[PDB]
Design a protein around this ligand. Structure first.
Ligand SMILES: CC1=CC(=O)CC(C)(C)[C@@]1(O)/C=C/C(C)=C\C(=O)O
Lengths: 183, 183
């Protein structure tokens, strides 16, 4: 029942963390890794996580997300996310960096607008677990960001940690709701 | 919430009328949220009535201080410090209502570095019983002044996000306290 990963989960994710969630830090950057257990099939979770054009399905504070007219989801495509965690609303342009449907890995970079200066980059991976009868999922999300050059010069990285956590909670809630409509 | 059942709805009609209904003033906007909680209403009330400890059930609070003499009576104030990353650093709030017999509390934001002018919130706590089970519904509503008519949706969107999140945290915290009190 503790939300923290078990030793078995942790062992099973080591290779994934090494491959996908380990960053080469530039001086004056930092990185963080979050995990969320989800009681729903990993295919269902991944179908949510992979939709680069619809982050608002599991993320908080999103006013809108717009993509190109005829949107084809591929590495290098961009989206504009308007967030209302700032008043007035801020626009960030994000690039899709990784999409592997076989291995269930996606990731993005903030390349313009608000927080461009941060060099924010994030990776999310979805993992299958099975024991006894039961199948469940663990999502890992990590990011790397520049540290602010100040004593409180918009040092917003605690807010980044906090919002990654809440977003993973929203993903769990949404995905678990959907799986109970399956049968 | 996840959503009020038809039964809950009808039982709450009077409370909704008395505490959670607003006159359709232009340049103001209002919203009502509900949250089901699987814990005793006395326990939920004991958390929500603590004007000097909003951080027990609210997200985004770094700290809160009250006067050096604090008696919690209507008209008292608290100085809430917010984590960085949000439209505000601080908020000064005044207790409007505290009714221990009816389980109703409310507050108004009166100062601070932020964007929520004339924000006023009311929270009411409700007992439900069906068969051999007790649960709580919490209702929270607010009214606030909009910057403009087009930027009204953003203010409502922001405040709705925080209120929904804080009610979710209230549910998780009350549910966790109820377990640990038993065993
Ligand atoms: C989290 C936060 C960010 C802001 O920018 C405004 C303010 C500082 C007031 C606030 O505490 C907002 C609190 C809200 C909406 C509701 C509450 O507290 O019941």
């Amino acid at each position: 029942m503790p939300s923290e990963l078990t030793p078995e989960e942790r062992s099973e994710l080591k290779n994934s963390i090494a491959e996908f969630h380990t960053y080469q830090l530039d001086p004056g950057s930092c990185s963080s890794l979050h995990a969320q257990r989800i009681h729903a099939p990993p295919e269902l979770v991944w179908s949510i996580v992979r939709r680069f054009d619809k982050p608002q399905t599991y993320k908080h504070f999103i006013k809108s997300c717009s993509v190109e007219q005829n949107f084809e989801m591929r590495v290098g495509c961009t989206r504009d996310v308007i967030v209302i965690s700032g008043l007035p609303a801020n626009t960030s342009t994000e690039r899709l960096d990784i999409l592997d449907d076989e291995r269930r890995v996606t990731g993005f970079s903030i390349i313009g607008g608000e927080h461009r200066l941060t060099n924010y980059k994030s990776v999310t991976t979805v993992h299958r677990f099975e024991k006894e009868n039961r199948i469940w999922t663990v999502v890992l999300e990590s990011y790397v960001v520049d540290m602010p050059e100040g004593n409180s010069e918009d040092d917003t990285r605690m807010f980044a940690d906090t919002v990654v956590k809440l977003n993973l909670q929203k993903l769990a809630t949404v995905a678990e709701a959907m799986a109970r409509n399956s049968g």
